[PDB]
Amino acid sequence: GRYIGPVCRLCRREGVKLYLKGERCYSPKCAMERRPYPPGQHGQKRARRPSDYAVRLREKQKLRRIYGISERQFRNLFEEASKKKGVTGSVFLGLLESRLDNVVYRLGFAVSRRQARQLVRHGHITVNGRRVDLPSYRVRPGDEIAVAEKSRNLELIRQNLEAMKGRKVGPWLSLDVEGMKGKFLRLPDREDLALPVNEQLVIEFYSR
Amino acid sequence: MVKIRLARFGSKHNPHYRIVVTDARRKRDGKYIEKIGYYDPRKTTPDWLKVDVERARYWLSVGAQPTDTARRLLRQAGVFRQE
Amino acid sequence: RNLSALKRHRQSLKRRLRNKAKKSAIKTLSKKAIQLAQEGKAEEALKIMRKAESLIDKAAKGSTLHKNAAARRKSRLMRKVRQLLEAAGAPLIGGGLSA
Amino acid sequence: PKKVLTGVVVSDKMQKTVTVLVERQFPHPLYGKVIKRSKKYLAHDPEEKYKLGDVVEIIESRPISKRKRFRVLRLVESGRMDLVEKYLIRRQNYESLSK
RNA sequence: UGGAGAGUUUGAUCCUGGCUCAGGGUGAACGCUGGCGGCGUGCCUAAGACAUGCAAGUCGUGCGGGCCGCGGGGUUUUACUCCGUGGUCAGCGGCGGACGGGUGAGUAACGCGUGGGUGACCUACCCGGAAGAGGGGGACAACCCGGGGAAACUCGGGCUAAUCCCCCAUGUGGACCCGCCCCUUGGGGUGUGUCCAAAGGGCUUUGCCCGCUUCCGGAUGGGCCCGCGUCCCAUCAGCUAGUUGGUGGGGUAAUGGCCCACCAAGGCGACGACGGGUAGCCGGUCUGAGAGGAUGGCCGGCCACAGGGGCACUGAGACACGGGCCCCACUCCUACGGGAGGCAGCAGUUAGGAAUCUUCCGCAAUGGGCGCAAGCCUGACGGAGCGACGCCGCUUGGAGGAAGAAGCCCUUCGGGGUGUAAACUCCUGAACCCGGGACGAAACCCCCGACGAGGGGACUGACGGUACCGGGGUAAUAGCGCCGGCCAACUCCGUGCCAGCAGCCGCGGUAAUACGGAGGGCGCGAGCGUUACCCGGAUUCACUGGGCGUAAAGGGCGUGUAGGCGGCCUGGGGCGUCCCAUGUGAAAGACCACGGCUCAACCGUGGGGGAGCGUGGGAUACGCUCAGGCUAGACG
RNA sequence: CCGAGGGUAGGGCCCGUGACUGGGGCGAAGUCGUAACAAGGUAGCUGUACCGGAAGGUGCGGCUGGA
Ligand SMILES: [Mg+2]
Ligand SMILES: [Mg+2]
Ligand SMILES: [Mg+2]
Ligand SMILES: [Mg+2]
Ligand SMILES: [Mg+2]
Ligand SMILES: [Mg+2]
Ligand SMILES: [Mg+2]
Ligand SMILES: [Mg+2]
Ligand SMILES: [Mg+2]
Ligand SMILES: [Mg+2]
Ligand SMILES: [Mg+2]
Ligand SMILES: [Mg+2]
Ligand SMILES: [Mg+2]
Ligand SMILES: [Mg+2]
Ligand SMILES: [Mg+2]
Ligand SMILES: [Mg+2]
Ligand SMILES: [Mg+2]
Ligand SMILES: [Mg+2]
Ligand SMILES: [Mg+2]
Ligand SMILES: [Mg+2]
Ligand SMILES: [Mg+2]
Ligand SMILES: [Mg+2]
Ligand SMILES: [Mg+2]
Ligand SMILES: [Mg+2]
Ligand SMILES: [Mg+2]
Ligand SMILES: [Mg+2]
Ligand SMILES: [Mg+2]
Ligand SMILES: [Mg+2]
Ligand SMILES: [Mg+2]
Ligand SMILES: [Mg+2]
Ligand SMILES: [Mg+2]
Ligand SMILES: [Mg+2]
Ligand SMILES: [Mg+2]
Ligand SMILES: [Mg+2]
Ligand SMILES: [Mg+2]
Ligand SMILES: [Mg+2]
Ligand SMILES: [Mg+2]
Ligand SMILES: [Mg+2]
Ligand SMILES: [Mg+2]
Ligand SMILES: [Mg+2]
Ligand SMILES: [Mg+2]
Ligand SMILES: [Mg+2]
Ligand SMILES: [Mg+2]
Ligand SMILES: [Mg+2]
Ligand SMILES: [Mg+2]
Ligand SMILES: [Mg+2]
Ligand SMILES: [Mg+2]
Ligand SMILES: [Mg+2]
Ligand SMILES: [Mg+2]
Ligand SMILES: [Mg+2]
Ligand SMILES: [Mg+2]
Ligand SMILES: [Mg+2]
Ligand SMILES: [Mg+2]
Ligand SMILES: [Mg+2]
Ligand SMILES: [Mg+2]
Ligand SMILES: [Mg+2]
Ligand SMILES: [Mg+2]
Ligand SMILES: [Mg+2]
Ligand SMILES: [Mg+2]
Ligand SMILES: [Mg+2]
Ligand SMILES: [Mg+2]
Ligand SMILES: [Mg+2]
Ligand SMILES: [Mg+2]
Ligand SMILES: [Mg+2]
Ligand SMILES: [Mg+2]
Ligand SMILES: [Mg+2]
Ligand SMILES: [Mg+2]
Ligand SMILES: [Mg+2]
Ligand SMILES: [Mg+2]
Ligand SMILES: [Mg+2]
Ligand SMILES: [Mg+2]
Ligand SMILES: [Mg+2]
Ligand SMILES: [Mg+2]
Ligand SMILES: [Mg+2]
Ligand SMILES: [Mg+2]
Ligand SMILES: [Mg+2]
Ligand SMILES: [Mg+2]
Ligand SMILES: [Mg+2]
Ligand SMILES: [Mg+2]
Ligand SMILES: [Mg+2]
Ligand SMILES: [Mg+2]
Ligand SMILES: [Mg+2]
Ligand SMILES: [Mg+2]
Ligand SMILES: [Mg+2]
Ligand SMILES: [Mg+2]
Ligand SMILES: [Mg+2]
Ligand SMILES: [Mg+2]
Ligand SMILES: [Mg+2]
Ligand SMILES: [Mg+2]
Ligand SMILES: [Mg+2]
Ligand SMILES: [Mg+2]
Ligand SMILES: [Zn+2]
């Protein structure tokens, strides 16, 4: 659950600025542009030679801690994805980006996935009329992730969609800032996605 | 007697009865003889009661006493009608 | 402490006493019929057979016997009376045996 | 349908009883080889024209006696003595597996 | 739609080879920590013993009564209370206690699974149709009187009724011997003979309903039988004498040595009999790439058991959990003559244990019994409580935020680390506050209708004022493991072959990245670890998938029994094989779609496999066998 | 008649235990020899017999994994 708290620490430790804080990670004080070396007392030393297990674990962490998924939730998503008929990584990434908090992040009601987690958990976001208080709520292809009436006049959603006035949501998504909704069109892929994650190493992590 | 009756299934406060033919002896979820229909007593789907009216008529032809509610769920499926 | 299946216990003792009387009467009329037909007798030994046959079919009318146990009782009584009257019987006045 | 089983008799030396040797063959459930696990059934044939060496067929019949739950049906071969000697030596293999 | 490897024998390598490890899992337990909710799930051991409450009753519309509460005179007081009954209390009678629930002791087997057979059968209640229900009696409790017994209860005499029992007739019909064909192991059709029925109750009455008798068919539930699958031990090799078979019986619903007489010597056995150990079996579940291995918890089927053992009775069915009788063990009452008990029902107590809960609410629902119905019972079940036991979901904040505070730990003394992490700035507000508040439930019933179908009516929620919804509202639990390699994550200090670690390798002897602490990190997170057990890795029992010179492994060698295997051309059969439509492969799970709970877990529906195994047809190469021939094998 | 159970007598299988003893593993840098691996200072190993504190020796024979 949320793992907690310190997240530019995980912007570090994998060497890629996977944006978790949001406007901090876009502003020039990310402490990943400032210090690209991993956290720790050693930290800026020689890279310990990344083992074959180490590279798969680091990039599986790059896939996980972008979305903030607890590991058994992630692994049950994976063992649903393997049974789900399709190219396994390129249905797994769409399943990960079809969570409600991630669809709210990609829809830009929040600068971060953890802010989007608070949005969906505190009952702000509605899916198809009624509010859905679940960050793990999957979104079927072709439904309208909207903002309800108690949160339509929110200063946070107002500033977020103010930021998103003119921003580019994905081709598997849509946007409507005049009604603050968005149809989740289809599932995305890695060619659709800006992931710093070779998905194949995450696939290879689970036949351990 | 070969009763048509509502064998319960489904979770706690998720009742989903199954109109079915059993012996009068067996337990509620026992080995039945034929599932003649299903009845959600909550109507959470539009198609919440479905009964195979032909095999319900057959099991009434070979002698059955559908109980105090299986009578109701066959009448709302149109089995006792004569046309 | 108790239950009123004790009514069923005191019913079962009564029914035991009440069908043993029409169960052992079967066996002794069987013995009389077989013995009198074994000693070369006659209609006097077939009246015993019709007596036992009436006793059996009156026993089967309740819970003393099955229909099938009644039929087996008669089919191994009167079959034996007929093959015992084979030995120089000639039932001219014959009752339960069908010519 | 009653069970109908071919077989060669190997013993007839009772009264009203022959012992037929059905040799079913079936693939191994694990290794898949075709193996011939035989089995000896008692049978009934009161006319007793099936001597030790005939090859009969066997119908699943109501129990004539305990283990004697089969009937002979029909002959399909005369004395197949070269097949009955296989078993008649396979029995005589057992005095040498003693202690 | 599917398969990860590594550490370690040596100076080093390769091989074989074992051990160990990372993975998943559970009826779990244990340590540390612990906020919520849903869903499941929870004495695996002592099938040890049980306090206490309940867990099986029900019907006046079958019958007669005692008993008290509204109306009272056949006589000039109720007062043979007869009645109209109005209920309770037992009793007779019928039905239900054989189902539901619990457990794994036993059982290695027709127990189970699975496919058949029942010409060898039953099947109460239910349904289709047939054919009826006419006359008689009788004792047996209640009850009354009397006696015994501490009590349990028991006995004697007198009653008395009923759907209680008995007798007679009618006999559509059915049974039985053979009046004989026919189906062909033991039938509806038959025919003389012989035998057999029955019950009334409520009601609007010259009416139906609830019953009843007999029979035929059904449907379900079974009984029994058989083919096939059914662990380990061969350092268990012979076993069996009712054993095997017959005949004649007896019993059973029925076949059977199921049991008994006489005769006959049989039956079984290296395809594992017998004996021993273990064990409920299966759908499944776990694992697996799959084959397979393990397992049988919860849920579902079946068997077995109800303190151990035996036994029948009643009944449609029991050889009966909460019926009986007996022996034995134990407990409790005893006035010492005897009684009473039976938690492996729910809850619970004790004991063993590492460990497994509440003496909860309720029949609202579904089911079950009785009743015509109201109704009653239901610790079946519906729910709730408890326990991170598991699964799933959620929170412990979010966005800002310093070339970077303090504290702490290193430091090459420069600084670096914890680290946007904190304080603080906003603002979203779990818990909590208030109001509303179910879906779960429309049937039974009442009326129109017909004492049917259809229309109309009302009453009825344990959970629960719960979920949820509407409003307000506080920044509001994080821990555990690990950091030598395997295995992701490293420095300092303290220790000095000690204290200790450990899964293997091994560390520890004064610079320890292996011990103890701090910092930091990694993993997972309301969990993390450990243990045990299982499967995987383990191709380390090798069918897919191993070998045998030296690594573990060729029998000392030959002859040869069982076996296993089998040259070439031909032909039928179609036994293996293969194919085709079915029949089964229950449901639940597994799988796939698509839906309902805020998603998910769960749950519902639909669809598809589904090994097998039976049935019917087809195929004929190959395996088979019978027949024919050949000469390349073999022999002469 | 059968009959659970009890008794008696004798079997079978399995288990605990038993003075003592035979070996076996495993300790601490024990004593005692030096058997083996170098032509282990007697080529070795094995069968078997006998002996010997002990590894072992020898006999007969084999083998080469010895020359
Ligand atoms: Mg923050
Ligand atoms: Mg895998
Ligand atoms: Mg016989
Ligand atoms: Mg190595
Ligand atoms: Mg070595
Ligand atoms: Mg190596
Ligand atoms: Mg090998
Ligand atoms: Mg695996
Ligand atoms: Mg614990
Ligand atoms: Mg219990
Ligand atoms: Mg106990
Ligand atoms: Mg007990
Ligand atoms: Mg009560
Ligand atoms: Mg009564
Ligand atoms: Mg009535
Ligand atoms: Mg239970
Ligand atoms: Mg057992
Ligand atoms: Mg055995
Ligand atoms: Mg045995
Ligand atoms: Mg068997
Ligand atoms: Mg079967
Ligand atoms: Mg009855
Ligand atoms: Mg008296
Ligand atoms: Mg009459
Ligand atoms: Mg009468
Ligand atoms: Mg059947
Ligand atoms: Mg019977
Ligand atoms: Mg018979
Ligand atoms: Mg026998
Ligand atoms: Mg035994
Ligand atoms: Mg098994
Ligand atoms: Mg494998
Ligand atoms: Mg299995
Ligand atoms: Mg069960
Ligand atoms: Mg018992
Ligand atoms: Mg007992
Ligand atoms: Mg018993
Ligand atoms: Mg009876
Ligand atoms: Mg009972
Ligand atoms: Mg029971
Ligand atoms: Mg009993
Ligand atoms: Mg006294
Ligand atoms: Mg005394
Ligand atoms: Mg007494
Ligand atoms: Mg009890
Ligand atoms: Mg009911
Ligand atoms: Mg409940
Ligand atoms: Mg819980
Ligand atoms: Mg904060
Ligand atoms: Mg500081
Ligand atoms: Mg507010
Ligand atoms: Mg506010
Ligand atoms: Mg209502
Ligand atoms: Mg009712
Ligand atoms: Mg209405
Ligand atoms: Mg009412
Ligand atoms: Mg509010
Ligand atoms: Mg590493
Ligand atoms: Mg020390
Ligand atoms: Mg440690
Ligand atoms: Mg020092
Ligand atoms: Mg040190
Ligand atoms: Mg350490
Ligand atoms: Mg293993
Ligand atoms: Mg294996
Ligand atoms: Mg092989
Ligand atoms: Mg070797
Ligand atoms: Mg060797
Ligand atoms: Mg050898
Ligand atoms: Mg040897
Ligand atoms: Mg050799
Ligand atoms: Mg040879
Ligand atoms: Mg041969
Ligand atoms: Mg074939
Ligand atoms: Mg089919
Ligand atoms: Mg299925
Ligand atoms: Mg939904
Ligand atoms: Mg479901
Ligand atoms: Mg379904
Ligand atoms: Mg096959
Ligand atoms: Mg020492
Ligand atoms: Mg010294
Ligand atoms: Mg030497
Ligand atoms: Mg030497
Ligand atoms: Mg030497
Ligand atoms: Mg020498
Ligand atoms: Mg040498
Ligand atoms: Mg000596
Ligand atoms: Mg030596
Ligand atoms: Mg010498
Ligand atoms: Mg020598
Ligand atoms: Zn960042």
Side-chain angles (χ1 to χ4, degrees):
Chain A
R2 285 209 70 257
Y3 158 76
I4 206 56
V7 281
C8 275
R9 198 179 163 211
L10 307 169
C11 278
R12 314 202 290 197
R13 157 65 48 196
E14 287 95 327
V16 191
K17 199 206 292 167
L18 49 96
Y19 322 108
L20 312 180
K21 286 285 295 296
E23 314 268 14
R24 164 69 162 275
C25 288
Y26 284 128
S27 161
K29 37 175 80 76
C30 188
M32 160 60 199
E33 300 276 328
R34 307 167 56 110
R35 283 166 311 189
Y37 48 87
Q41 165 164 332
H42 313 285
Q44 38 191 348
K45 275 187 60 179
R46 168 172 287 151
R48 170 60 62 93
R49 176 68 66 113
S51 297
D52 295 275
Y53 171 77
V55 52
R56 266 89 188 154
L57 181 50
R58 285 305 105 202
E59 193 165 65
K60 185 256 152 187
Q61 284 319 294
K62 290 162 92 190
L63 186 45
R64 182 173 97 106
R65 270 147 167 189
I66 280 179
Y67 307 123
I69 307 309
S70 60
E71 150 71 28
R72 204 200 282 260
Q73 186 168 183
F74 196 91
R75 191 175 205 269
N76 283 293
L77 180 55
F78 188 83
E79 283 294 325
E80 193 146 5
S82 302
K83 272 77 163 175
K84 181 59 71 75
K85 291 171 286 307
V87 42
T88 293
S90 289
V91 74
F92 179 45
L93 298 197
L95 281 184
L96 277 159
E97 300 253 359
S98 88
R99 284 168 65 95
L100 190 50
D101 61 348
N102 195 86
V103 165
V104 161
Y105 172 70
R106 292 259 180 255
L107 263 288
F109 304 114
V111 299
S112 90
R113 286 177 177 86
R114 306 174 320 141
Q115 188 170 71
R117 177 142 190 143
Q118 266 197 352
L119 294 187
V120 297
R121 192 52 193 136
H122 290 239
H124 302 250
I125 297 310
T126 168
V127 185
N128 304 315
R130 291 96 56 207
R131 70 168 182 270
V132 177
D133 62 336
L134 261 290
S136 44
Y137 172 58
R138 276 199 210 175
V139 191
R140 296 201 287 206
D143 306 290
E144 288 201 348
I145 310 291
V147 180
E149 51 255 39
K150 214 194 152 198
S151 315
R152 181 175 284 274
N153 283 259
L154 191 43
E155 43 262 29
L156 176 62
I157 316 296
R158 151 193 287 105
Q159 197 261 359
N160 280 131
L161 287 157
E162 169 263 343
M164 292 295 120
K165 283 177 181 68
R167 292 303 100 192
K168 199 52 212 177
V169 300
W172 79 101
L173 295 166
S174 46
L175 186 81
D176 164 42
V177 303
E178 296 207 333
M180 48 186 68
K181 66 180 75 175
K183 314 183 66 45
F184 172 83
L185 288 190
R186 64 165 191 266
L187 308 153
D189 204 307
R190 219 198 162 208
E191 60 261 29
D192 297 328
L193 263 181
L195 271 195
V197 173
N198 202 279
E199 38 174 270
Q200 280 74 29
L201 297 205
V202 182
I203 310 309
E204 287 145 50
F205 183 56
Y206 285 128
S207 169
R208 176 170 178 81
Chain B
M1 65 188 83
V2 180
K3 279 188 223 140
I4 320 181
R5 64 191 207 187
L6 263 66
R8 193 180 151 107
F9 290 92
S11 313
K12 279 193 305 213
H13 325 284
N14 199 31
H16 281 75
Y17 296 107
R18 174 178 262 157
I19 314 108
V20 83
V21 297
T22 43
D23 202 354
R25 270 175 200 81
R26 296 221 211 279
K27 70 201 62 50
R28 191 179 21 79
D29 311 348
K31 189 176 87 69
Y32 60 76
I33 317 292
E34 195 203 343
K35 178 251 184 182
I36 76 154
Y38 66 102
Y39 156 65
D40 192 348
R42 206 181 259 200
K43 307 187 269 276
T44 42
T45 169
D47 269 310
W48 48 273
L49 163 76
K50 195 176 165 56
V51 177
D52 188 21
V53 58
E54 286 296 320
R55 282 309 267 259
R57 273 170 192 155
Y58 161 70
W59 284 112
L60 281 156
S61 73
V62 288
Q65 280 72 235
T67 50
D68 317 289
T69 168
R71 290 302 267 207
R72 193 265 312 277
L73 279 317
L74 295 158
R75 256 196 285 178
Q76 214 182 13
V79 194
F80 299 117
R81 205 185 308 127
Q82 68 279 347
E83 269 96 6
Chain C
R1 286 101 166 101
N2 56 335
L3 293 182
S4 296
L6 258 63
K7 180 186 305 202
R8 307 281 320 207
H9 176 225
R10 305 163 308 115
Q11 273 181 15
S12 45
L13 295 201
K14 277 183 193 163
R15 291 163 99 84
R16 179 188 140 273
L17 155 70
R18 209 261 323 286
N19 68 356
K20 194 58 176 100
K22 54 195 67 172
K23 179 77 64 77
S24 81
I26 312 296
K27 296 174 188 170
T28 174
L29 269 302
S30 289
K31 290 318 155 293
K32 263 165 74 175
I34 288 163
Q35 185 53 45
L36 297 185
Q38 210 276 343
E39 283 183 37
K41 309 160 186 237
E43 207 271 311
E44 50 180 346
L46 283 192
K47 212 176 300 161
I48 312 292
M49 180 178 112
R50 301 188 323 125
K51 271 155 173 72
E53 183 167 3
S54 168
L55 279 166
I56 288 157
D57 271 317
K58 273 152 165 208
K61 217 208 298 186
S63 281
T64 316
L65 282 170
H66 260 279
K67 280 77 59 178
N68 213 351
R72 201 205 67 248
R73 280 305 149 90
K74 299 194 286 169
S75 171
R76 284 159 203 215
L77 168 130
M78 91 171 67
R79 170 183 215 277
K80 198 58 68 62
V81 190
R82 186 196 176 153
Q83 289 109 37
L84 198 40
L85 279 152
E86 172 259 341
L92 282 69
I93 178 173
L97 156 71
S98 169
Chain D
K2 282 172 185 288
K3 184 57 142 162
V4 200
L5 285 182
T6 178
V8 52
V9 308
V10 288
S11 277
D12 45 2
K13 56 184 78 70
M14 294 71 70
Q15 291 269 36
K16 292 196 180 226
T17 312
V18 76
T19 304
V20 65
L21 182 41
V22 175
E23 297 183 349
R24 68 186 205 96
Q25 70 162 11
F26 77 115
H28 214 276
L30 191 43
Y31 312 105
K33 196 208 197 72
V34 46
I35 42 170
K36 305 190 174 204
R37 300 304 214 213
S38 43
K39 195 167 178 66
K40 257 168 72 198
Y41 296 143
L42 290 163
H44 178 47
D45 40 10
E47 310 170 352
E48 275 179 339
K49 55 211 164 304
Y50 311 98
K51 56 183 286 295
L52 198 144
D54 299 294
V55 171
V56 291
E57 215 175 16
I58 285 306
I59 194 170
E60 181 261 321
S61 287
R62 58 97 160 158
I64 298 105
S65 161
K66 169 200 201 157
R67 220 195 169 278
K68 210 186 141 163
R69 275 79 189 266
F70 282 119
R71 268 185 304 181
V72 186
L73 215 55
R74 61 197 172 110
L75 266 168
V76 287
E77 178 45 75
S78 73
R80 209 185 269 246
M81 282 269 184
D82 48 346
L83 192 43
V84 80
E85 267 291 326
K86 285 261 174 62
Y87 172 77
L88 276 161
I89 277 185
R90 181 177 171 268
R91 203 196 271 148
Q92 302 289 335
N93 220 320
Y94 292 154
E95 77 257 0
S96 196
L97 300 149
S98 43
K99 293 300 167 58

